[PDB]
């Protein structure tokens, strides 16, 4: 049922400016963009500085129960530990509901698993301290194999991650169903269903893409499992298709 999906993954959504670039002006205006006429998205996505003004908009609008994600390490995953710890500190003091940081994936694909597993733990500490979600964004677009998908997840998972992440979107290849599958999986194979969740991203765009990405966590987990805490769309023009998807533009 499309409509069904739709209205579902609406809801769901962390939306993001179109071409994930934010100036105040496109952050108040994709504050109004959230609340939309069959309801609100879960959240927005924004760099850290437009914390403070989001905050503001979405008050001003009625709509505070909007949450607002934001980025670390981003959108490089380098694996300097100290510095993505500072920008998870300051993202924490602007007043994030949730940080998403970038894996190392450079240092994985390397054959460095450590460093992907310390630098998440240390951004966990920081974010579970101050009662923030912390989302760990594994670039499956620059992974590529199966393996490293895999390796990436289970090491996220095990350095405390609340969820894992498709992508950036500042590389070409984002979220694909096959790499999606392969995430879940892992979460389904650690048995971390209640404490993990799953984020497709980049390049997710059309209604019946999304539908397809909740199709699988329904199989795996059940229907009710892709709530908003453990399932969210990393997305910005899919917004207008799941609209008109129900009737809308």
Same mark, same amino acid.
């Given at each position: ?12 959504? =962390?939306?993001?400016?179109? &071409? ?11 504050? =109004? ?29 009625? /709509? ?13 995953? &380098? ?9 998870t500190r300051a993202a924490i003091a602007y007043g994030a509901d949730g940080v998403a940081v970038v894996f190392p994936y450079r240092a994985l694909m390397a054959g460095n698993e450590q460093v992907g597993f310390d630098l998440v733990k240390a951004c966990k500490e920081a974010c579970a ?17 199966? $393996? ?14 609340? =969820?894992?992440?498709?992508? /950036? ?21 650690? *048995?971390?269903?209640?404490?993990? *969740?799953?984020?497709?991203?980049? *390049?997710?765009? /059309? ?24 399932? $969210? ?13 129900? *009737?809308?533009?």
């Amino acid at each position: 049922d499309l409509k069904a999906s739709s209205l579902r993954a609406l809801k769901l959504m =962390h939306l993001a400016t179109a &071409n994930g670039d934010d100036t105040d002006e496109k952050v108040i205006a994709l504050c =109004h963009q959230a609340k939309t006429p069959v309801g609100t998205t879960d959240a927005i996505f924004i760099y850290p500085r437009f914390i403070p003004i989001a905050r503001k908009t979405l008050k001003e609008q009625g /709509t505070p129960e909007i949450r607002i994600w934001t980025s670390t390490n981003f959108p490089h995953g &380098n694996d300097d530990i100290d510095i993505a710890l500072a920008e998870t500190r300051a993202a924490i003091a602007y007043g994030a509901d949730g940080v998403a940081v970038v894996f190392p994936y450079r240092a994985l694909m390397a054959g460095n698993e450590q460093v992907g597993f310390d630098l998440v733990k240390a951004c966990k500490e920081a974010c579970a301290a101050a009662n923030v979600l912390l989302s760990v964004i594994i670039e499956t677009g620059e992974l590529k194999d199966e $393996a490293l998908i895999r390796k990436a997840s289970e090491i996220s998972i095990k350095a405390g991650a609340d =969820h894992i992440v498709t992508s /950036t979107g500042k590389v070409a290849v984002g979220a694909t169903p096959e790499s999606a599958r392969i995430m879940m999986e892992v979460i389904r194979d650690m *048995g971390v269903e209640k404490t993990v *969740g799953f984020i497709p991203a980049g *390049g997710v765009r /059309t209604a019946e893409e999304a539908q397809k990405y909740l199709a699988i966590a329904d199989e795996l987990f059940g229907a009710d499992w892709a709530d908003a805490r453990h399932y $969210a769309f990393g997305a910005s023009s899919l917004l207008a298709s799941l609209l008109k998807a129900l *009737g809308y533009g």
